[PDB]
Amino acid sequence: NIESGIAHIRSTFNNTIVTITDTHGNAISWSSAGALGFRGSRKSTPFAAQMAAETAAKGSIEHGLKTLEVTVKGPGSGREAAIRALQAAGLEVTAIRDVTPVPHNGCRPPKRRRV
């Protein structure tokens, strides 16, 4: 029953993560995009981000979690709503991380969709 923990913001066009883990990155409860029986486009809404974040928060409160250190890693779709949901309990976002390649074209990305 651990006091402190982490969550991990990493946002794209329509993908975001924020799982509830311990200080050393051992998991406890998890939040990332959906998880909650939502499907399709509803899954990527800001609303559905809240309900995923609440459900992982209320999972971790039962493990005696009081505070959540969260990261920063660019803007995206439903990142702000996911934080608002977590501020039911209350917490901080101190760290700032990144998912970027130090080469433009480190690995070659997949081809542009013709739509």
Partner: protein, 65 residues
Amino acid sequence: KVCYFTSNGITHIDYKDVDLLKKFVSERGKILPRRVTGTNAKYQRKLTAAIKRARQMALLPYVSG
């Protein structure tokens, strides 16, 4: 804007001169543009080289926060 290197009369930028190079990087570690710093084109080249040599030997960071 005014160039730090032209104004102060610096004609050579050491890679090892860390404290100077910390003025021309972000909190995260990224090299700052000429628009922000207002440095000259020639010095921005000399500076960049100095940054990149510094990063090789862990004087400055690649990425940090």
